[PDB]
């Protein structure tokens, strides 16, 4: 069901990790300060863990989602920054997997959308 | 440039308002209570008004953004509900536009909406922070 996307992530973990770390770092340069590379790499790795627990849907990864959202809040990432990052993550995955295009986009969207919206929810909850 | 998407929104305002109002309503049916048709219509209208100010970026609609997000909080829409709704809003606009490359249309749509929606999510969360 989410097999094509899931399997690609599983098979391309090391390259995704680097890709997404680099995405966090690039976005951070637009912010008033930049955390260290290891901090962004750990966020990336936690995220990938979430994706690999989320083959069915966002439910299995409940505890890691809550941890990641709390961590984001605690270390000073805005919702704006996190949402921007997560949007860029799936788009950079697309470029990797694309390499029909439209059906791939919809595959990616079906796997990620509920994960990301649950992460957003738990970020807001970790203030609410 | 966001000209292509902006123009389609500008030319199809009444249609989009109905489409988005219906999406909200459909989604509300899975929540523990439903608000009124007018409440959801007013949300769709406030959102479209944001879009029409946003041809460059999300900055001109700062105040409108902040008001929409705050109202969402106050009326009891979760972030989950809001983020699901907004995702469906662009996807439904895609189906409309696409039926008039598909891939480049999606990226045009994403380019326009993504910074607006992220800013909405931010103001939603900030209402609590
Ligand atoms: Na767990």
From Swiss-Prot, chain B:
What is the purpose of this protein?
A: Acts as a positive regulator of sigma-B activity in response to salt and heat stress by stimulating the activity of the RsbT kinase toward RsbS in vitro.
> How does the annotation summarize its subunit structure?
Interacts with RsbRB and RsbS in the stressosome. The stressosome probably also contains RsbRC and RsbRD.
Name listed for the protein in its UniProt record:
RsbT co-antagonist protein RsbRA
PTM description: Phosphorylated by RsbT. This threonine phosphorylation abrogates the ability of RsbRA to stimulate RsbT in vitro.
Q: State what the entry records as the consequence of deleting this gene.
A: Cells lacking this gene have a decreased response to salt stress, indicating that RsbRA is a positive regulator of sigma-B activity. Its activity is dependent on RsbRB.
């Amino acid at each position: 069901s989410n097999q094509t996307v899931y399997q690609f992530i599983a098979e391309n973990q090391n390259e995704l990790l680097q890709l997404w770390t680099d995405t966090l770092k690039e976005l951070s340069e637009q912010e008033s300060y930049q955390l260290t590379d290891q901090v962004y790499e750990n966020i990336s790795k936690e995220y990938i863990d979430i994706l690999l627990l989320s083959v069915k849907d966002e439910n299995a990864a409940e505890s890691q989602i809550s941890e990641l959202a709390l961590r984001a809040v605690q270390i000073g990432l805005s919702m704006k920054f996190l949402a921007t990052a997560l949007a860029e993550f799936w788009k950079r995955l697309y470029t990797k997997m694309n390499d029909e295009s439209t059906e791939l986009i919809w595959q990616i969207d079906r796997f990620f959308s509920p994960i990301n919206t649950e992460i957003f929810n738990q970020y807001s909850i970790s203030w609410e």
